[PDB]
Design a binder for this molecule. Structure first.
Ligand SMILES: CCCCCCCC/C=C\CCCCCCCC(=O)O[C@@H](COC(=O)CCCCCCCCCCCCCCC)COP(=O)([O-])OCC[N+](C)(C)C
Ligand SMILES: CCCCCCCC/C=C\CCCCCCCC(=O)O[C@@H](COC(=O)CCCCCCCCCCCCCCC)COP(=O)([O-])OCC[N+](C)(C)C
Ligand SMILES: CCCCCCCCCCCCCCCCCCCC(=O)O[C@H](COC(=O)CCCCCCCCCCCCCC)COP(=O)(O)OCCN
Ligand SMILES: CCCCCCCCCCCCCCCCCCCC(=O)O[C@H](COC(=O)CCCCCCCCCCCCCC)COP(=O)(O)OCCN
Ligand SMILES: CCCCCCCC/C=C\CCCCCCCC(=O)OC[C@H](CO)OC(=O)CCCCCCCCCCCCCCC
Ligand SMILES: CCCCCCCC/C=C\CCCCCCCC(=O)OC[C@H](CO)OC(=O)CCCCCCCCCCCCCCC
Ligand SMILES: CCCCCCCC/C=C\CCCCCCCC(=O)OC[C@H](CO)OC(=O)CCCCCCCCCCCCCCC
Ligand SMILES: CC(C)CCC[C@@H](C)[C@H]1CC[C@H]2[C@@H]3CC=C4C[C@@H](OC(=O)CCC(=O)O)CC[C@]4(C)[C@H]3CC[C@]12C
Ligand SMILES: CC(C)CCC[C@@H](C)[C@H]1CC[C@H]2[C@@H]3CC=C4C[C@@H](OC(=O)CCC(=O)O)CC[C@]4(C)[C@H]3CC[C@]12C
Ligand SMILES: CC(C)CCC[C@@H](C)[C@H]1CC[C@H]2[C@@H]3CC=C4C[C@@H](OC(=O)CCC(=O)O)CC[C@]4(C)[C@H]3CC[C@]12C
Ligand SMILES: [Ca+2]
Ligand SMILES: [Ca+2]
Ligand SMILES: [Zn+2]
Ligand SMILES: [Zn+2]
Lengths: 675, 40, 166, 675, 47
């Protein structure tokens, strides 16, 4: 039971001011005139009177989009400050032209008319403003330590951040870009890249910068979709500041630009150089052509080596043929690797240092070619780009393992000369180490074949999606490792008092890899291995029993093991499944764009003339006119895009408002004529 | 200051197509009636 | 919670824990029912540790025995059968009572079906449903948690770590 | 290169007819008059001329909602057939009144004006039509064999079905129900039930009948939400054609009606009879009150038996107290069942026919009370309702098992007198069979405790959702069983040649329940058991080996087992998980309504005065004025609902059309006055 | 010193606390002795 009052009271204006505001709002070309005369003579009305909701007479007239009252008030020298911004926001060209013809605010004090027009993205008002030689400030580098930036960040961080965001939002306007830039596509590429990089430095305002970068990418794509001819498309794609613009787009991660249908058709035409009407043929004949071209890989290569200008020697220069030949060569290498571990070619397993066999002699040139190709690619093409592939890491590991295997084999051959039973060799015998490294490198080289899946229309998107989920798998791995370490520490602390020697165990075997598992929690390493193997159910339940009858200790150990099993197998795995599902739901939307970007990147690596020969055979020893053409095509594209966007801007609300205003104007004119 | 800015922003957000259409229809009806009465 | 990558994930897992606790009740009731039944059926055939090999009694021996002789052991056996660590010959009695052995095997099979085919899949389904709603507001909850964590180091009390604070 | 022509040409009308149609469409009170005069005199115009798009002049005027031309044409005796339907569909009251004042069509020939008005759900037009004593046909029973129905279904099934659907769609109109029914709530209940039952007989038009039933349910609920007082709510809920209307709603499956907040408050007030301000107390004190009331269950019952009118004897008549007492009694029974299988109370396991122990003597009265209560409930309350619970099946099985156990114990006690070692008893000893049945009944009785979960706010919805998924689990069971049978047949056919006797096996054990598994596929029953147990990984891999060295047979058996494992564990289980997820997604939306319906059904079973005592103690031996009140409240509710729906019907499109038409009319009037 | 922020934390105002202007102030208070912490590379920050 407490009354309600007004705490922050507003100082009301007099009846004269209220009547003046009412007349201004209603619209009376004569009553407002006589009110202004009275204000001039007797000062009964304040010319600068304000509505309690901060709405002066000029603002009321602007919101009423009637220009006669505004012109009269301008002639009467009313306070005109901060009215051009209201006109711009209301998007009224006539009023904007009128004010351009010469406390409390709804706009921050850093906003300029040109910046506000750019925020609105109105081409007609932006052009009108830019016609009067306006400028826009440009911000400092993302990581800048200059005194002016440091002082600004030290006095008003909120103001600094808001000003930077406003400037970038103005600069990212498609209409401003089209009006003021000479290379709109390149400008959009660079601006999108800069905004994407800035979003992670200003982590608080991340979504705004993300949306600005998306806007720039959409503008570039939509500008590309306005091409009407193959000649125009080639002029756009081949412009050098052979497909220089496409390479720049790939560098700047313009996936929607690259995956556009007109670009994909050009790329496919370049890809199928020697097979006109490839999509006309049946899948059976295409498959048979693939097999026949694959089997002739040793030829077409010797021909290219002995006669590049010959008809046969020019066949391997086509991208699809080159890809098929490289694939066939890699498959042959893998088949020899398979042949290495067979009974047919490898015998006499009793020699300490064995000379290389025929299969190893055949294998060596492939390894040399792989290493040479990796080094040559890394030298020619950029060192910093070589590491942003995530497959070159596998290549490096595989080649390092092969080099270590060769070195260990040579060392063993030099050091050892004779025979000895394998059962009495030491643990660290060079032959044993070389065999282990060879097996690991075989696994890696066989797993490398995944990267060829992106060339297929059915397996490529699936491979991209799996590669996208791998990161979140890596995210869960951390929590799992922490839980595993905690429980391993506890179990080892409990059980380390009951260690036994291998002598007293059956068969003199110690650990969990024996037929009767024992000493599962005697050391930290063994405890970690046991807790890892219990995830798949390969650890038996009698490993929690000690030889003595310590029932309390055995029960505590069993309870520890059961709690670990519950936490690991009932909770963490199901949470992993749930978040896998959530990730795949979002990933499945953009699978096509990512797959086409990946396939374009894969195709573009076979276009150049470097590294034509497969690894087995690769170790044997005017500008102005182009600018005018680009400018003409850009003019046409910008005109078409602007016209299309203007015709799209026709909306029901705008049309209804325009018709209502026009009908009101005509009715007023007819009433005045009658009167 | 904060309350004034919030109220002004909400008022400017309250501008909707249905309300504007109803207001314009009512104002046009009133002006048409006034003109008809003046003629009569 | 101080990390930008692990914090939201930790918050989401802590949010799902409550619904895990919700399923635990139904699982416990089913487990108690089946343990009561199996112990009632099998309590007539208890054997002493003297007559067993190595003088070991229970399911933590190399040859599992007396799995359903007491209520505590029955509960432990039915718990460990969730992960597949209980062998199938524990349903056999030393005498040739084929009817009793078949009834015990059918009880064990019904428990296995109900626990591993129905309840776990329902748990997975409702985990998915919960995560779908939780994933929307992860950022707000993570930032609230990180703010709470940060604010605990602003004050001047307890500046020194525990080794030096005594 | 083939030209495009017109195949189905329309016979065009002459220039006179085209001019007449143009004048009618444009609107000319004098030009149309002189055209009609010319048609009368020189017959230059056809009064019945039709637009090529089937649009006569009267239809054009109706769509123009100008009544003067329609009245003039009616005075000129133009073909007026099938115009009232167009007026009704356009929903123009003035035109409808005008035509009511006295080839090609867009309406099927079975549609009447009243049916069309009911389809539109316009209260003003429905009232206007019903004021003139109109009728609507009513259809025959869902399963009717009368000659007229058989002949109609034998001549035109499409026409018959369309007519039936149209009649039901007209009858299911909320406005028609409110206008013409004296008990709208009961009418909505019955109509929704009938439509739901009809949807599964007309399986082709299932969705239409489902939507009609949903419409009826929504109407009944929305009518209920218009109560403003507890007296009105009690008048509505207690009306008998003690909560008769609520019981009828429960019978007709009106979940949204029952789960409404005003009804739930009344039910909670009735439920907490003896605890005013129950929700005011803390959960700790509420819990402690629960425990204390539970422990005093033997008392409050003897008090009710020896003095029902006493202060102590009237406590058990409250529903919450009765529920707590029954729960405590059941928990005591389960605790005694737990005590049955312990070392403390049961000894001397060597007797063939043993006399009952003290625990069994204590157990028997509970079983007798359970059986008596089941029989009494089944007699008093309806036999056909007793089977639609799905818990009474568990009750019946449990009580049958207890009866069989008692009978077998009595038979064994009568037949056998002496002692014999248990190891030399036969397979089918009555004591063994009774023990097995007792254990199974113990499992069932312990599992019965699930039904008490619906009383809790946290476990109830979860239990309802699981019970909803059980049906789809049952759906997958069929496919799994078929696959299992196929593979069992194949494996038994392959392996039945290598059967071995139990004598030659170690320990004389045969089957897969031995320590060394053998004879896994020797018989069909054993093959089925092995393939069942392989789902959980309890079958070892050496069971596919025969004693002889038949490598081809062993490999074929291993491949059969591997194919079965892949199909069962990699495909079917994952599909089950996927469809579980899909089912839960839809189930999770309406969990609250279903849970509240279930809790209301559970609460209502403790309101009546029959079966007050728990099973251990239950074996010891004017209408006119109510009608006027209901009619007044129904009048008020219908008026409020109609007013609310009318105020909700105000839409932007309708308001804009009305304002445009009114402005056009006023402009035309002003122009005519000026002219 | 941030009494209103503490009250908001007590009343569970998650959307109020997680607003970008508040987070910037909190980060400025948190990185008292490392001006331009977000300017540095992750390697040097780790070291
Ligand atoms: C991941 C990226 C890197 C990939 C691998 C690159 C380097 C490859 C090869 C490195 C070869 C090291 C030298 C071996 C001989 C020298 C020697 O004395 O070895 C000592 C140790 O030897 C070992 O323990 C062998 C370890 C080999 C690497 C194992 C992991 C390979 C992972 C592969 C990826 C999965 C012998 O012991 P001791 O001193 O007598 O005591
Ligand atoms: C589900 C709904 C029904 C529930 C159960 C109601 C009926 C309960 C009890 C029925 C009792 C039958 C009579 C037993 C003694 C008579 C006899 O000679 O038995 C013969 C067969 O005996 C058996 O094989 C026992 C079968 C008992 C039912 C087992 C399934 C219970 C499922 C419970 C639900 C899970 C002895 O063999 P023989 O003739 O010597 O050769
Ligand atoms: C004593 C030691 C004994 C060891 C025994 C085991 C030896 C073998 C170990 C194998 C380890 C795992 C190897 C996995 C190979 C396949 C990788 C996944 C393939 C896939 O679908 O994802 C691709 C990623 O692969 C990649 O990026 C390839 C990652 C290569 C890592 C190499 C590490 C060495 C996508 O392709 P993408 O790269 O485009 O993905 C997006 C990048 N933004
Ligand atoms: C040699 C033989 C050896 C046998 C060894 C095993 C013996 C025990 C066998 C146990 C078989 C399964 C028992 C399951 C008990 C719980 C049932 C599920 C509970 C639940 O959440 O769902 C309720 C359904 O229960 C129900 O409807 C109860 C179903 C009772 C079936 C009884 C069959 C006998 C929902 O409740 P709701 O009924 O409202 O569901 C909607 C109806 N529209
Ligand atoms: C980070 C992740 C946070 C997750 C937090 C939740 C953790 C759940 C902890 C549950 C403890 C279960 C311990 C059971 C145990 O050790 O028994 C072994 C021991 C064997 O000696 O058994 C017992 O001590 C008691 C036997 C009865 C156990 C009842 C089973 C209830 C557990 C339900 C889990 C559902 C499967
Ligand atoms: C609360 C949860 C409510 C869920 C209610 C549903 C319960 C499902 C009950 C199914 C009973 C299966 C019993 C099978 C059994 O005990 O065999 C063991 C015994 C071993 O002695 O085997 C048999 O007695 C019959 C052998 C053939 C069994 C056919 C398998 C059909 C079961 C399909 C399950 C899918 C996996
Ligand atoms: C109704 C459901 C429709 C589903 C239809 C699909 C069925 C899938 C059939 C796959 C046959 C797998 C048979 C493998 C087998 O029997 O090996 C046992 C035998 C053991 O003797 O092994 C072999 O004969 C070949 C060994 C290599 C097998 C390669 C594994 C490929 C299977 C991938 C499955 C993924 C897990
Ligand atoms: C699962 C087993 C059989 C793998 C055996 C290894 C190789 C025989 C496979 C592994 C990956 C295969 C490659 C995966 C995808 C492609 C792309 C494919 O190109 C297309 O499909 C082009 C037409 C299109 O775009 O659809 C040509 C075959 C090739 C190189 C495949 C050749 C055969 C490879 C090397
Ligand atoms: C999985 C195994 C390796 C765990 C080993 C235990 C410790 C070495 C780990 C466990 C949790 C780790 C902490 C997890 C998160 C953080 C917050 C992190 O802060 C930031 O990342 C601040 C910048 C940002 O907001 O991104 C600083 C390291 C620290 C304390 C980590 C330090 C190392 C810890 C204690
Ligand atoms: C998992 C183990 C511990 C089960 C042990 C068996 C019994 C001790 C449990 C099983 C189900 C329980 C019942 C489940 C739900 C309810 C409803 C509950 O009612 C409310 O919660 C009313 C208030 C509300 O609506 O929230 C009162 C206890 C009771 C009968 C419980 C009493 C204790 C019961 C019988
Ligand atoms: Ca490479
Ligand atoms: Ca019952
Ligand atoms: Zn700077
Ligand atoms: Zn009939």
């Amino acid at each position: 039971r407490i009354p309600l009052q007004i705490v922050r009271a507003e100082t009301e204006l007099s009846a004269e001011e209220k009547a003046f505001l009412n007349a201004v709002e209603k619209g009376d070309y004569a009553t407002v005139k006589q009110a202004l005369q009275e204000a001039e003579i007797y000062y009964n009305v304040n010319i600068n009177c304000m509505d309690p909701l901060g709405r002066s007479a000029l603002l009321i007239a602007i919101e009423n989009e009637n220009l006669e009252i505004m012109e009269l008030l301008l002639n009467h020298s009313v306070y005109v400050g901060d009215a051009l911004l209201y006109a711009i926001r209301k998007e009224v060209v006539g009023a904007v032209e009128l004010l351009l013809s010469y406390q409390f605010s709804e706009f921050t004090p850093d906003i300029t008319p040109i910046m506000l027009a750019a925020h609105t993205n109105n081409y007609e008002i932006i052009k009108l403003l830019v016609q009067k030689r306006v400028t826009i400030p440009r911000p400092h580098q993302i990581r800048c330590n200059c005194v002016e930036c440091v002082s600004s960040s030290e006095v008003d961080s909120l103001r600094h951040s808001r000003s930077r965001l406003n400037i970038y939002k103005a600069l990212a306007s498609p209409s401003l870009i089209a009006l003021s830039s000479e290379d709109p596509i390149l400008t959009a590429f660079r601006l999108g890249w800069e905004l994407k990089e800035l979003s992670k430095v200003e982590n608080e305002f991340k979504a705004e910068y993300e949306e600005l970068s998306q806007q720039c990418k959409l503008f570039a794509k939509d500008l590309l979709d306005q091409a009407r001819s193959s000649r125009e498309l080639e002029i756009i794609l081949n412009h050098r500041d052979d497909l220089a613009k496409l390479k720049v787009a790939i560098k700047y991660h313009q996936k929607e630009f690259v995956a556009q249908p007109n670009c994909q058709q050009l790329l496919a035409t370049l890809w199928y150089d020697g097979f006109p009407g490839w999509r006309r043929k049946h899948w059976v004949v295409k498959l048979l052509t693939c097999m026949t071209i694959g089997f002739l890989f040793p030829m077409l290569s010797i021909a290219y080596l002995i006669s590049p200008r010959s008809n046969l020697g020019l066949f391997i220069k086509k991208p699809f043929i080159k890809f098929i030949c490289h694939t066939a060569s890699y498959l042959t290498f893998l088949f020899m690797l398979l042949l290495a571990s067979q009974h047919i070619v490898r015998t006499d397993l009793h020699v300490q240092g064995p000379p290389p066999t025929v299969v190893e002699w055949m294998i060596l040139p492939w390894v040399l070619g792989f290493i040479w190709g990796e080094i040559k690619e890394m030298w020619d093409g950029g060192f910093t780009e070589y590491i942003h592939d995530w497959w070159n890491l596998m290549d490096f590991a595989m080649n390092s393992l092969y080099l270590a295997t060769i070195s260990l084999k040579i060392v063993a051959y030099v050091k050892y000369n004779g025979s000895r039973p394998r059962e009495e060799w030491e643990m660290w015998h060079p032959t044993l180490i070389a065999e282990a490294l060879f097996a690991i490198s075989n696994i890696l080289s066989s797993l490398r074949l995944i990267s060829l899946f992106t060339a297929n229309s059915h397996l490529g998107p699936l491979q991209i999606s799996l590669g996208r989920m791998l990161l979140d798998i890596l995210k869960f791995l951390f929590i799992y490792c922490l839980v595993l370490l905690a429980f391993a520490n506890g179990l080892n602390q409990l059980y380390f008092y009951y260690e036994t020697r291998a002598i007293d165990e059956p068969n003199n075997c110690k650990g969990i890899r024996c037929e009767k598992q024992n000493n599962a929690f005697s050391t930290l390493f063994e405890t970690l291995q046991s807790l890892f193997w219990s995830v798949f159910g390969l650890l038996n339940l009698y490993v929690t029993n000690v030889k003595a009858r310590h029932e309390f200790t055995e029960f505590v150990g069993a309870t520890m093991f059961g709690t670990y099993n519950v936490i690991s197998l009932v909770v963490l795995l199901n949470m992993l499944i749930a978040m896998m599902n959530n990730s795949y739901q979002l990933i499945a939307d953009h699978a096509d764009i990512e797959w086409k970007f990946a396939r374009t990147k894969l195709w573009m690596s076979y276009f150049d003339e470097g590294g034509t020969l497969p690894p087995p055979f690769n170790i044997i020893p005017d500008s102005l006119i182009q600018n005018q053409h680009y400018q003409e095509v850009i003019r046409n594209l910008v005109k078409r895009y602007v016209a299309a966007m203007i015709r799209n801007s026709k909306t029901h609300e705008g049309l209804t408002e325009e018709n209502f205003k026009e009908l009101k104007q005509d009715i007023s004119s007819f009433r005045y004529e009658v009167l």
